[PDB]
Amino acid sequence: ILMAMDQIERASDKIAQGVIIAYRDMQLERDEMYGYVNIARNLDGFQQI
């Protein structure tokens, strides 16, 4: 139940996993379930708080 915690937690459609702010013009992603959605798959390259 702990090894698969992240998959159960993230797949929920009521809570998110954080917010990324960059103040730089960045494009959005295209997915076959949300259409044009603003999603960041990874969090590399920023300060984690």
């Binding site: 960045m26 494009q27 295209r30 997915d31 076959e32 798959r41 990874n42 590399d44 390259g45």
Partner: protein, 397 residues
């Protein structure tokens, strides 16, 4: 390193299998992997070039994502896929060409160019499509302190040397007895010559020996053995080491008897063959030792009776020849062969941008100068450059 191969394999798959008309269900895994790769590589900066004459280029990865909706692929899908593919493959090829042109005398198993240094981070370890290629599999095996292997067709492993050693010598050079050989490529030609046909040697039989070691460990080698060597079967005029002496050599190929080969490893006997020819094989050997007897025929015809006088005045000298060719063999280290294009591609890329000679590799990538002083660090660097060259060979055909 392995991340680069995963990217190369994914790029090849996207370049090839994405064609009009195919069912989308056949590339669902491929399209998902491609989307994951685009996500991982996006939003990063990479630099290349700066040493020698490689044009410095700057890459910024701002790209979209391929759709996962169309039931059957269409033309615009292909055009967008190729639009991404061209930039990705240009980046891959430039990364490879930048990696090939830098070397380190120590720790050659590690990345040297900035691109592979950045790709070593754990963040970029999300793209590991497969390791089906033999060279990349060998690299992974070497990365975990385990046995490796390679398969080659006629691998040039013998050092290039051309010399002859005399056992009996005279200043006038008219009564000689010695061994002449040439170790070129993957073929060995050894011929022992005598001027008297054993008229004064004990028991009318002359014994000849010849030793050629090796710098690595060949394994499971098919060896072709044939008598009466080719190159040493016609008259020659050859200079000597004195720097002022020239002698003549008139060969007459006798028949070889009691041919003895000895495959040695670490100063021990592993395979021994006697009085056999055709195609032979040894399991594991490190050096080759050959033994044979030059025998004077006790029975002669007048046409032969004039050929071998019983006095010092000699009209024709005698010798026997042996040829040894390695057709197929298995090695544990990277070796340049005649059935691949790796070392040739590395040298071509080196000379294309005219990189100045490094501290480790001899100038011009001269193979003989590399093999005459083979070192394990040079072996590791050669393995790295050969793996990256094989990665390059998967893109430009």
């Amino acid at each position: 390193m392995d991340v680069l191969y995963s990217l190369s394999k994914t790029l090849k798959d996207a370049r090839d299998k994405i064609v009009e008309g195919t069912l989308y269900s056949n590339v669902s895994d491929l399209i998902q992997q491609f989307n994951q790769m685009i996500i991982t590589m996006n939003g990063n900066e990479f630099q290349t070039g700066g040493i020698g004459n490689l044009p410095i280029r700057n890459w910024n990865f701002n790209f979209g994502l391929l759709g996962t909706t169309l039931l059957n692929l269409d033309a615009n899908y292909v055009e967008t896929a190729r639009n991404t593919i061209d930039y990705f493959v240009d980046f891959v090829d430039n990364v490879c060409m930048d990696e090939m042109v830098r070397e380190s005398q120590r720790n050659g198993i590690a990345p040297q160019s900035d691109s592979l240094r950045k790709l070593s981070a754990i963040k970029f370890k999300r793209i590991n499509f497969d390791n089906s290629s033999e060279y990349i599999e060998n690299w992974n095996l070497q990365n975990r302190r385990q046995r490796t292997g390679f398969t080659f067709h006629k691998p040039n492993i013998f050092p290039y040397s051309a010399s002859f050693t005399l056992n009996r010598s005279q200043p006038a050079h008219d009564n000689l007895m010695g061994t002449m050989w040439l170790n070129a490529g993957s073929e060995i030609q050894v011929a022992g010559f005598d001027y008297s046909c054993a008229i004064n040697a004990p028991a009318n039989i002359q014994q000849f020996e010849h030793i050629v070691p090796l710098r690595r460990v060949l394994t499971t080698a098919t060896i072709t053995l044939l008598p009466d060597a080719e190159r040493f079967s016609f008259p020659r005029v050859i200079n000597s080491a004195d720097g002022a002496t020239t002698w003549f050599f008139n060969p007459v190929i006798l028949r070889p008897n009691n041919v003895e080969v000895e495959f040695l490893l670490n100063g021990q006997i592993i395979n021994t063959y006697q009085a056999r020819f055709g195609t032979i094989v040894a399991r594991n050997f490190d050096t080759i030792r050959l033994s044979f007897q030059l025998m004077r025929p006790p029975n002669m015809t007048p046409a032969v009776a004039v050929l071998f006088p019983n006095a010092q005045p000699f009209e024709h000298h005698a010798t026997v020849g042996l040829t040894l060719r390695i057709e197929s063999a298995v090695c544990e280290s990277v070796l340049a062969d005649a059935s691949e294009t790796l070392l040739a591609n590395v040298t071509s890329v080196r000379q294309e941008y005219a990189i100045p000679v490094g501290p480790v590799f001899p100038p011009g990538m001269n193979w003989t100068d590399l093999i005459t002083n083979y070192s394990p660090s040079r072996e590791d660097n050669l393995q790295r450059v050969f793996t990256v060259a094989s990665i390059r060979s998967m893109l430009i055909k």
